[model samples]
Target: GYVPAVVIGTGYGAAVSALRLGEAGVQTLMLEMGQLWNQPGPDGNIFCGMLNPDKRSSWFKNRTEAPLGSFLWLDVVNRNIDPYAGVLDRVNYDQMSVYVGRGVGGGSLVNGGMAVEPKRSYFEEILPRVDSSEMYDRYFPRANSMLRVNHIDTKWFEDTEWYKFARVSREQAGKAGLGTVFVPNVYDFGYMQREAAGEVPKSALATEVIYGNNHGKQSLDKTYLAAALGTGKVTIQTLHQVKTIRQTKDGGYALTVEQKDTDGKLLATKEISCRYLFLGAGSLGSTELLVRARDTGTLPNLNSEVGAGWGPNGNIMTARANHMWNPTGAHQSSIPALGIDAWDNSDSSVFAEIAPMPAGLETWVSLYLAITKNPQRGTFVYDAATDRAKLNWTRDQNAPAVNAAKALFDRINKANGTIYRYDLFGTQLKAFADDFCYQPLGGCVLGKATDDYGRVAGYKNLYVTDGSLIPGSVGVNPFVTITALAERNVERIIKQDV
Candidate 1:
């Protein structure tokens, strides 16, 4: 078998990389562990999760057809497992919690469609060796344009009650002297305009997005991946999982892929050989592969920093103020429209952002909040026997940054003069349980394992383009930053060959 120029996963980094490579006339092979999402389900809904109001109807009990990950079984199948025990058991559930999409578009299929560009200062700091001017002046905007990233219109923001919650939070933060701004989203506002015109029904505007929004939002399945495939230069093999990567004697890479049939059974195993390999498997997926290759001695020439300098960018969900003022005809859209910067500029301790939610579903009246900052680094260790990547994350000594963010929240709550109640929202507003939900990150770090261009330290033609390569947290949602960085790295690779 002849190796293609690139082999990648479904992450935005990989998607952009393949698009650039394919455009450059380099053949690329994309392996997705999930199924291709082509059309709406039997209910005529294109949303990712079960659409029934009962929340249990058509639950993804059958592991074969369900979306990737086991955590989703909790909602669909009424299943629950201890995270630690599930990890040790090698159960498929832990991977399921964060909603990793399958199909041609990858995570873009399931993400909130937020398209935020990284702060220029932070971007320069992360990849100091790379020329930031090129990324800032060229690739970042190019990626945003390709993704159709834009801000929601003022009318929509005003008419949508979901956005009001953000306003309320912002007011509260302002009273407490906190800075906030509107966060840019990758969602095509024109599609939202169509929905506003009644040409499309409410999806992102009226539904809880974490489960997946059917309309309104622009997913990769319909965006970049679609554009790439339209070129007819790229090919996607869904339900195919890359099991191993072996460096050929000639220095290229050989990949062993297992493809599952319609019945979800392993139907065939094929080998792909490629001259250049780009790993956009995401922080977890890319790191898992690299760790396995290193531990198994398949690609032992990996740099000493193969698996180091990891952080989830310190992800934690916290709520600030809950407003009971719900006007009639309030359009409670679930997507976030605003953000706040309690960004500790003095010490770089904490970065907090606020999201608005409508009084829908479980959250009757509330604003969603998230705060993160520089946290202790974590590692992803590959176990030889189970061939599994195990995450070992310990809280950093600067845990005070998190506490400081929490304290700021407490002040906001005090300023609002509302005694925080446990059940402000419906059963869905389980603040106690939701506050500690951490977005795990760090496995394959940048500058250490991989160079400024995301090339792994020791491998000549191997690279990583995912959240794993982010050296630190950007104090905001990471999707946009990850995608932008991926675009930057992949474009560099493409130019070198050109």
Candidate 2:
């Protein structure tokens, strides 16, 4: 029997699709490029934190056999021991480097775990056809509930110093007339409550995220994927990377999956056929997949807009409020609690968001950053020889937005609201000539490569449910928006019987 549905990657989009589809009684199969995080290591090691003492170490050598703690971001990408280089591509987007996650949870495994809802205006613009009120009222709340998103409460805010930087940034932002808000996050503070009670140790408090938190954080593996698995209608095949996807003559999908052993060696290449296929491989992953399928004539009827209208979300960074108030003792462990929103409606030329830093050894120093509106949109070109997508991004288009952001920063500095420097913490904050990309969006965009509902325009049973569908950057971290939109798209698909 043909598989009813196949979801690729276990990121926010894939997790949401799997759970929603499974609950609706659609038998689903999920293919992940990374291994399941299931190992034990030092206590309090969050997925984002480093696993071994030497952070940045790749843990894929024993990843499949090891427990979750072994999947720390630092270990997974450590320069010392090279790990399996999955299909996802990370291009140097000028000022900052782009890092996409691999494995069951995708980027959620290494992300900073800041669950931010997009500004209402930004959300409305991205999917203009979708009713705004229904989104905010219906699907938005539903998505939040499914992800267990909530704000850090008064107790944690009072006890933790992380909030202090956020508070200070807010005060300074208020002085500068830059609107700031306490952003909601997917982190379950209740889990931290359990940690305090000694039922679970304080994992987040140890700054042990990114590498894979030993104590549970709201990763896809622990949340949506877990729930989907519990439904028994969903099955996951870990470490199976999709090499290509082709539309079968019978109106289904035939996926070529490469299986690898724990030692980063290829085990076998297998094929699977599915009635419906969902690409939640994230922007890079999904874009590359689609680009390959189209360029290789596997699905050649792709629109002229297939790889156009891509943007790194016009990202930039400016250090504000260098004067630190005090050591953010407990705050160092918690993630970002506040953000500054300065979005320009008239011109997409500049958009800014600020995140606070813990008062580290340098208690008197901190940073608030922004990304300007850039015209340079990157492209994901197909390269058949490497069987990879050649991602070429330029910084020239960001000049106008960068200048605008600099002008704003100058005004803030003149008003004693913040500071800007070419360097920070002994590292060059800005690249000599490149846009500082903090958030990325676009490529395989809606109404382009995919239809309004993220279905590949020419393929009947193929769909995309990830950041790749975003027409452009919303000028924010984008996790919450990505999740909500994925939920919205899948809900529509299920209702429409696609």
Candidate 3:
């Protein structure tokens, strides 16, 4: 197959690039390694709930691997099932395990729908080479508007039983002299209100996140990819994975693609050629492809920074045990609506989301996923023996992140006279889950690995337009930034290169 342009993933960056390229009248093809996820199974739901997940809960594993590994040191959290191509995937390395979504909408399918914009100072510090003025003035608003970002109504949030967990956390933060901020998300707040009123089927109210949401959440497929398809110049081939990339003799690019089924059986392999190639695979996927191509003499001209400057966005998960009197209600909303924003505190700046424990029971727990500022970064090295890229990050590297989160939570616990939850992550008496992360940023860093506009330095008409372009951390949810950066880069590429 020949295409004018080919994007390697169907995530935020890839979706943005394809939309702009399609709008520019360029024939763009997006290759996704996962399923479309639009079809319902025998249960009449496209995705299963968190409590009762089946084969559709994991990516090609006989057992389900939920983030909360155990509750009270029991193995009842994870269940065994047939191996299939599911929505959530936990890619395990030696020391770090990264959770990612595997479908047409990518991480958007499983994320908590938090559409947060990073602080301007943090954004500038991360990518100083890019024009912050232009990004703030043009691209950020464009991306947010297109993604359909919205905020929960404060009136509804304060009066509803669903957000009792957030209000409890907010009261705790107030007791500790910390402030809480309302976090915006892409979920339809009106539909959520309707769900609470029993006028519609429940999704966010029914423990329907992390695996996939059946309704309300505005994933990329419902927004950018939908618009890209509406342009009539973009086509997506799901379950088609690009295995390899090399420069063609005609100054173009050629990809070795494998078409597979849900059972992980490869049905066919074909060579697809493209005039322009954009690598929008997430940090791991994009970096692995480039590293393999460079190390194997396929694209020898690639620079040394192809697989450097990777970080996990300083993600650390922790839980606090509230007093018996302060019970976080059973009807918790899966969508997090507020965050403890201490980014202004120079001692240990942390932005922690008051995450939900939607177990459908009254558990006096305050769960948090904290994002902090840390100096640690990881690098990916290609291993020919395994034919994969191995991240060189250790568990100890998360010490700074843990300390930052601990500083804030310690104050809260001291003020509220509460204790840390010890039985959430595993059997160990660990307070923080430092082994795994959700946000995988960097690898093909901007201005280091690629040009300011994400064009690969050594190869023309080749680009990196994903979270891989960010330098490790974005201080918040990263999909909005990835979308905006891709919007900025692909617009330039279409206007100048195309």
**TM-score, one value per model:** 0.84, 0.86, 0.98
Highest lDDT model number: 3
lDDT of 1 by residue, 153-184 (tens): 87776665445656666667787777777777
- What TM-score does model 3 achieve against the real structure? 0.98
Q: Give residue 285's lDDT in candidate 1 (0 to 100).
A: 76
lDDT of each: 0.62, 0.67, 0.91
Off by over 4 Å in 3: 69-77, 345-347
Candidate 3 deviation (Cα RMSD): 1.2
Q: Model 1 segments beyond 4 Å from truth?
A: 48-99, 193-197, 320-331, 347-351, 356-365, 395-398, 421-441
Q: Positional deviation of 431 in candidate 2, in angstroms? A: 8.1
Error of 2 at 263 (Å): 2.7
lDDT of 2 at 140: 75
Q: For model 2, what is the error of residue 318's alpha carbon versus the real structure, in angstroms, after optimal superposition?
A: 3.1
**Model 2 C-alpha lDDT per residue in residues 1-498, reported as the tens digit of each score:** 368999998988899999989999999999987777664434432233332333222444323211111221223434343444332224443334565666678777666577766668866766687677877888778877877777767677665544565665565656666666666666777676566556876666655554445564677887889999999999999878898888888888898999986556899999899998998988777888888988999888887677666776665555543554433333454456666666665353344444444323344434555555555577778889978777676556667667767766676566654555444322445512244343567778877778777888877778889888877677667777788888888989998965
Candidate number of the best TM-score: 3
Model 1 / residue 425 / CA error / Å: 12
Candidate 2: stretches off by over 4 Å: 42-79, 82-96, 155-159, 193-200, 324-331, 348-360, 425-438
